[PDB]
Design a protein around this ligand. Structure first.
Ligand SMILES: *[C@@H]1O[C@H](CO)[C@@H](O[C@@H]2O[C@H](CO)[C@@H](O)[C@H](O)[C@H]2NC(C)=O)[C@H](O)[C@H]1NC(C)=O
Ligand SMILES: *[C@@H]1O[C@H](CO)[C@@H](O[C@@H]2O[C@H](CO)[C@@H](O)[C@H](O)[C@H]2NC(C)=O)[C@H](O)[C@H]1NC(C)=O
Ligand SMILES: *[C@@H]1O[C@H](CO)[C@@H](O[C@@H]2O[C@H](CO)[C@@H](O)[C@H](O)[C@H]2NC(C)=O)[C@H](O)[C@H]1NC(C)=O
Ligand SMILES: *[C@@H]1O[C@H](CO)[C@@H](O[C@@H]2O[C@H](CO)[C@@H](O)[C@H](O)[C@H]2NC(C)=O)[C@H](O)[C@H]1NC(C)=O
Ligand SMILES: CCCCCCCC/C=C\CCCCCCCC(=O)O
Ligand SMILES: CCCCCCCC/C=C\CCCCCCCC(=O)O
Ligand SMILES: CCCCCCCCCCCCCCCC(=O)O
Ligand SMILES: CCCCCCCCCCCCCCCC(=O)O
Ligand SMILES: *[C@@H]1O[C@H](CO)[C@@H](O)[C@H](O)[C@H]1NC(C)=O
Ligand SMILES: *[C@@H]1O[C@H](CO)[C@@H](O)[C@H](O)[C@H]1NC(C)=O
Ligand SMILES: *[C@@H]1O[C@H](CO)[C@@H](O)[C@H](O)[C@H]1NC(C)=O
Ligand SMILES: *[C@@H]1O[C@H](CO)[C@@H](O)[C@H](O)[C@H]1NC(C)=O
Ligand SMILES: *[C@@H]1O[C@H](CO)[C@@H](O)[C@H](O)[C@H]1NC(C)=O
Ligand SMILES: *[C@@H]1O[C@H](CO)[C@@H](O)[C@H](O)[C@H]1NC(C)=O
Ligand SMILES: *[C@@H]1O[C@H](CO)[C@@H](O)[C@H](O)[C@H]1NC(C)=O
Lengths: 300, 193, 49, 96
């Protein structure tokens, strides 16, 4: 943990919302329009909202060897949900750049899918006296399988009292890892490495559901979104066409009915080697607000 | 909405809240009522079309078991430096004292406190057949597919022999009256309408 | 001619008086004030009022 | 503002319907909670007000008529009823 190294003035590229390109807009469900203009009331971002930036990094790496992870304190930033949010995923994954760690090593910037914990109730970690512990049924959103699987489950999380493992006296954070070299050999994608590394930290007790979703990965623009209402939790994604990737469409409802109040982005460090590493992109989170928008639909 | 229109028509979604409930406390569930039930236990939401049903479940039908008591909450508040601050239900939501109230109640007017929060419960025995309440709400027009009851299902028909005449239609639960004409594709075809 | 000048001034004043007075029509509600409807009824009755 | 006096209604025998009792309150506070905790309501019906608004607002005067009455004769107290109860015992006023 050294969070002044990650959110420094190295990359820090600001990315506001451009409504003239309709960034972060959720499409209406059950219906379509063609070649018209109308007003629509819904949950939308504010125009020119800068949002919040998350910079990720490969961990500490010895020559030829793997060490402890280089994460921020994102596991101790508990944020207010309030209406849900949308995430711009890796817009800088088409140019050159470092992640943040190897300042003299530009590597081709891959995309990083975010991981989330979401809950109604929050507390201290006992005996570490650290805040940020979810204590009842918590919702877990995990990307897996080199970005081909989305796990979503709703369980009680029991901290484990091993070497630190998010439940000892000494407690850095929860932090997740993956290996592009061994876990991401083509032909055999190991789609449980993030799940297993998460299960090192926690016992999953009394899971009400366990859903798995197919994720479409490429290196173009990506938008993810989450809202809650009285029918449950809704998940939104940009489709797979390279044809108007700013439009988000509903792809999942989850039977979660108690009100989500808090969320936590999970700090990651994908444990590539030292010489042949991959540089990492950012992602950007923007909050939704009840707003009226004027929308334009083409004939498609 | 009327109950007989739920029996002959289709809707986008159906939502059912249910619990055990004595029928002789029915007037405490009315909109406009003032007691502890609406304040601390359940407040009905009216933004969608909705129904409220009370019912008795008879002896040998179903595999529903009986609890020992009926039970509701009489108070929920937080203590402050000035005094009590009563926390009231939002429409459709759960009470903020729900985690305290999961500890159970053994006697009438038994309290449970954690930090600022305090809650008080009221129990009384179940006598005779069990009684229940159901809060039902429907949605129209928010989905490409429908929820339909089985008596409202008809087989299938075609339009290709009845173009350019006025017909009734029932298309994936969307019903009405209209004239149809073969055209060129516009709009997203995954959204169907 | 003087009566026509005063007639014009009065037609201008009459349009504004008739605008301001229609905010005290109850139209068959229990009040013409929205605040008293919100303070005296519940949500279902509030909407139809 | 001293508090309202409901102890005539809470002690004694309630009267018959033709000889009903009336109480009138101005300029006082009354604790609606613990009044509701003495009785078990079987039904209510209101006209141009709701009971949740009586609990959260203020009014110039309150007026209560009260009598003993069997709940299974409730439909004889409805407005528009035809029997002996409205004709010879009690007729509800709908001005306020
Ligand atoms: C929700 O989580 C809370 C934890 O915050 C549970 O309450 C705890 O239950 C244990 C039982 O051994 C007690 O020792 C703790 O003191 C309780 N915590 C508090 C803050 O009171 C609670 O049980 C969970 N909810 C349900 C329905 O099980
Ligand atoms: C989604 O994927 C996970 C992981 O592959 C499945 O989790 C397994 O579920 C079975 C039965 O529920 C358990 O016996 C295993 O222990 C679980 N394994 C792990 C690694 O968690 C889950 O079942 C999948 N969801 C569905 C609906 O099939
Ligand atoms: C809905 O379920 C009921 C179950 O009660 C179905 O009724 C049964 O149908 C079978 C087949 O003919 C009969 O042998 C039973 O005697 C019926 N039970 C009763 C109580 O009538 C009913 O068919 C179902 N509805 C539809 C539209 O399929
Ligand atoms: C209205 O009367 C009730 C009595 O039922 C008061 O509640 C009591 O308050 C005292 C001190 O606050 C407690 O010691 C009692 O145990 C309470 N009784 C019950 C049954 O809860 C209530 O405080 C009164 N309201 C106001 C505003 O004074
Ligand atoms: C039931 C006791 C009636 C006592 C009458 C004297 C108090 C008058 C003041 C407020 C009356 C409002 C109470 C409304 C009763 C309905 C209760 C409910 O079901 O919400
Ligand atoms: C008890 C009804 C038996 C008589 C029905 C046949 C006579 C119909 C003629 C007039 C009916 C009007 C009486 C209305 C009955 C309701 C009583 C009431 O108002 O409380
Ligand atoms: C999930 C089943 C186990 C829980 C058992 C709870 C059922 C008993 C409690 C009944 C409370 C219903 C509301 C009480 C007020 C009333 O009876 O009118
Ligand atoms: C103040 C107490 C002394 C007066 C005693 C009066 C006794 C009341 C008995 C008459 C009840 C009248 C209500 C009958 C109507 C009905 O129940 O349907
Ligand atoms: C880490 O925590 C400190 C204090 O807890 C906070 O000031 C800082 O903003 C956090 N780091 C980041 C990157 O948010
Ligand atoms: C990203 O780069 C690839 C190849 O470098 C290119 O084909 C693609 O069009 C670029 N993305 C966009 C949105 O232009
Ligand atoms: C440790 O946590 C307890 C809560 O159980 C709190 O009261 C105490 O102040 C904490 N200790 C420190 C040094 O903050
Ligand atoms: C899991 O569910 C069981 C019900 O069989 C319950 O007894 C237990 O307390 C639950 N676990 C937790 C951590 O609450
Ligand atoms: C259920 O009880 C009723 C009497 O209430 C009786 O007529 C009927 O035969 C019983 N059926 C079963 C399966 O017990
Ligand atoms: C209200 O006034 C009383 C009288 O001084 C005081 O004790 C109490 O703290 C006050 N409460 C609030 C919320 O201001
Ligand atoms: C309707 O139009 C489509 C495309 O324009 C065509 O393929 C189809 O044959 C037409 N059907 C009839 C019955 O004319």
């Amino acid at each position: 943990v050294q969070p002044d190294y990650f959110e420094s003035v190295h990359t820090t590229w600001p990315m506001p919302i451009d409504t003239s390109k309709a960034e972060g807009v959720i499409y209406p469900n059950g219906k379509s329009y063609s070649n018209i203009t109308l007003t629509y009331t819904g949950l939308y971002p504010k125009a020119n909202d800068l949002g919040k930036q998350y910079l990720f990094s490969d961990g500490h790496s010895a020559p030829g060897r793997l060490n402890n992870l280089f994460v921020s304190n994102y596991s101790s930033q508990v944020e207010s949900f309030d209406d849900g949010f949308v995430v711009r995923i890796g817009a800088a994954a088409n140019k050159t750049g470092t992640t943040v760690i190897s300042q003299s090593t530009f590597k081709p910037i891959k995309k990083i899918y975010p991981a989330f914990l979401l809950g109604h109730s929050v507390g201290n970690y006992t005996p570490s006296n650290r805040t940020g512990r979810y204590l009842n049924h918590t919702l877990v959103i995990l990307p897996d399988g080199c970005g081909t699987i989305l796990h979503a489950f709703y369980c009680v999380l029991h901290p484990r009292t091993q070497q630190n493992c998010a439940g000892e006296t000494n407690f850095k954070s929860l932090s997740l890892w993956d290996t592009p070299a061994s876990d991401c050999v083509s032909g055999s994608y190991n789609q449980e490495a993030t799940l297993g590394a998460f299960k090192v930290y926690f016992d999953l007790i009394n899971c009400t559901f366990r859903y798995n979703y197919t994720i479409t990965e490429d290196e173009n623009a990506e938008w993810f979104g989450i809202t809650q209402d009285t029918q449950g939790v809704h998940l939104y994604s940009s489709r797979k066409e390279n044809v108007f990737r700013n439009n988000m469409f509903h792809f999942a409802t989850l039977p979660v009915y108690q009100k989500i109040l808090y969320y936590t982005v999970i700090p990651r460090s994908i444990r590539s080697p030292f010489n042949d590493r991959k540089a990492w992109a950012a992602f950007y989170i923007y909050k939704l607000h009840p707003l009226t928008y004027l929308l334009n639909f083409d004939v498609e | 909405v009327s109950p007989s229109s739920l029996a002959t028509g289709c809707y986008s979604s159906l939502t059912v809240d249910y619990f055990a409930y004595s029928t002789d406390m029915s007037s405490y569930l009315q909109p406009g009522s003032a007691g502890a039930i609406v304040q601390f236990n359940y407040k009905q939401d009216f933004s969608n079309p909705t129904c409220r049903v009370l019912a008795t479940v008879p002896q040998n039908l179903t595999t529903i078991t009986k609890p020992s008591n009926y039970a509701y909450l009489t108070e929920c508040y937080k203590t402050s430096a000035y005094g009590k601050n009563y926390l009231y239900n939002a429409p459709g939501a759960y009470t903020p004292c729900l985690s305290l109230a999961s500890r159970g109640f053994s006697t009438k007017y038994q309290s449970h406190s954690d930090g600022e929060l305090t809650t008080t419960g009221y129990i009384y025995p179940v006598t005779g057949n069990l009684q229940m309440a159901f809060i039902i709400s429907v949605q129209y027009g928010t989905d490409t597919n429908s929820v339909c009851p089985m008596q409202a299902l008809r087989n299938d028909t075609s339009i290709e022999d009845k173009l350019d005449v006025c017909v009734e239609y029932s298309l994936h639960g969307i019903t009405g009256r209209g004239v149809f004409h073969n055209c060129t594709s516009v709009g997203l075809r995954n959204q169907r309408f | 001619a003087f009566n026509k000048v005063q007639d014009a001034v009065n037609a201008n004043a009459m349009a504004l008086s008739k605008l301001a007075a229609e905010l005290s029509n109850t139209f068959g509600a229990i009040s013409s004030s929205i605040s008293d409807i919100l303070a005296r009824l519940d949500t279902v009755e509030q909407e139809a009022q | 503002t001293q508090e309202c006096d409901f102890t005539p209604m809470l002690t004694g025998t309630p009267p018959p319907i033709y000889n009903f009792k009336r109480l009138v309150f101005t300029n006082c506070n009354y604790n609606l909670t613990k009044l509701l905790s003495l009785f078990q309501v079987s039904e209510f019906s209101c006209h141009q007000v709701s009971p949740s608004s009586l609990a959260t607002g203020c009014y110039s005067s309150l007026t209560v008529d009260y009598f003993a009455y069997s709940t299974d004769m409730s439909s004889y107290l409805q407005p528009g009823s035809a029997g002996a109860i409205v004709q010879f015992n009690y007729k509800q006023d709908f001005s306020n």
